[PDB]
């Protein structure tokens, strides 16, 4: 129970924790190698996989970010805001671990909705990094303006930060 609550944070912070998960991509699906346990832990730790798979894709984007300032003044300033949105994910991890130690219930179902609200934040960041695999400054302004033409001011506010910051 609690050892699986500790296991999700290490994949939330990066790559695998207690056991090996052997999945870079498509989700970091968690294998425990146990059959006599219930069949309802593999699915919860597959929700914890897509949050950690989408986290390490942002971190490897910041590793490819490192230039002098190459082929664009817009390109890494896009990623400067994406490190800000990477930074917002870490503060939401700082509330989770303070639940873990002693100083609420340590169940897998309660933390699911505590991660379901990052799930609407991070998954629309995955659409923002999919649109610009190959890119150039000036064409970034045509990427985020196609994302603000969609309605729904939930991520439309979030791409309006990027629209006001790509344009800058």
């Amino acid at each position: 129970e609690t050892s699986l609550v500790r296991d999700l944070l290490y994949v939330f912070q990066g790559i695998d924790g207690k056991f090996v998960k052997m999945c870079n991509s498509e989700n970091c699906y968690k294998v425990d190698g146990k059959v006599a346990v219930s069949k309802s832990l593999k699915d919860i730790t597959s929700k914890l996989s897509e949050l950690g798979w989408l986290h390490n894709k942002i971190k490897k984007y910041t590793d490819q970010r490192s230039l002098d300032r190459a082929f664009g003044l817009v390109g890494q300033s896009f990623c400067a805001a994406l490190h800000q949105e990477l930074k917002e994910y870490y503060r939401l991890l700082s509330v989770l671990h303070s639940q873990l130690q002693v100083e609420s219930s340590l169940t897998l179902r309660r933390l699911l909705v505590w991660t379901f609200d990052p799930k609407i934040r991070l998954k629309t960041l995955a659409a923002l990094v999919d649109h610009c695999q190959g890119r150039k400054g000036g064409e970034l302004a045509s990427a985020v303006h196609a994302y603000t033409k969609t309605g729904d001011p939930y991520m439309r506010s979030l791409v309006q930060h990027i629209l006001g910051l790509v344009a800058y």
């Binding site: 219930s38 069949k39 309802s40 699915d43 919860i44 219930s105 169940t107 179902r109 309660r110 699911l112 909705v113 379901f116 609200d117 609407i120 659409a127 033409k149 969609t150 309605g151 729904d152 939930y154």
Partner: protein, 225 residues
């Protein structure tokens, strides 16, 4: 016997989260989007049948969390994309109501109705959203008649004042991108069409054609104005 009831209740609470359980198995009907849940036989058949009243709630909860998954997968810019975000918000308000029972499972006793009066506020939202889903099944939704279909469904539902208020919240949040293009066109004269969210389309003379599908909640004479 009552311990066998209790682990079936915990399996039921996972099924209403939207996730597969242990003794309750999931059977695909149209691609497990309309989930016909099937529990095994119980030594007491009655308490099994009380669970049978509750599997349509997660069936209809699976239809609307996958409805708002579908409209964002094709990146629709229309007003149905903003209607589904309220359904995402009502689905987020769903998951906090389930976690009160997880807090009650720490210290507390379940009854047959301690299940029920949590489920009946949500099986009433399910049956309202299933009536939303079956109008989608008949063929719709493009922007102006998404508002028309939602206007028909609120004027049909009048008489249950409890969920009349939530369908009021749906029909006014869906009109929020539309009342942009009200203000941009009747006070400035500019247009924005991601696909097209307004019935007035271009093409000196330079005439315009209103489309005969994007008519709003009211009839044609204010749409010509």
């Amino acid at each position: 016997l009552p311990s066998q009831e209790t682990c079936l209740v915990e399996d039921l609470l996972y099924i209403l989260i939207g996730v597969d359980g242990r003794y309750i198995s999931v059977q695909p009907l149209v691609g497990r989007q309309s989930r016909s849940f099937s529990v095994e036989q119980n030594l007491d058949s009655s308490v099994k049948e009380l669970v049978n009243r509750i599997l349509p709630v997660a069936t209809n909860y699976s239809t609307v969390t996958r409805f708002v998954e579908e409209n964002s997968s094709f990146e629709y810019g229309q007003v149905n994309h903003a209607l589904g975000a309220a359904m995402r918000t009502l689905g987020k308000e769903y998951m906090i109501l389930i976690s009160q029972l997880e807090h009650l499972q720490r210290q507390g006793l379940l009854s047959l109705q301690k299940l029920w009066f949590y489920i009946q506020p949500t099986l009433r939202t399910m049956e309202v959203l299933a009536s939303i889903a079956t109008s989608l099944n008949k063929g719709e939704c493009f922007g102006g008649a998404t508002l028309s279909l939602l206007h028909d469904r609120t004027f049909g539902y009048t008489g249950d004042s409890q969920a009349q208020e939530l369908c009021l919240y749906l029909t006014k949040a869906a009109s929020a991108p539309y009342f942009d293009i009200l203000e941009r066109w009747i006070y400035r004269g500019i247009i924005n069409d991601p696909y097209s969210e307004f019935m007035v389309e271009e093409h000196w003379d330079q005439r315009y054609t209103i489309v005969q599908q994007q008519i709003p909640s009211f009839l044609q004479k204010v749409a010509d104005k």
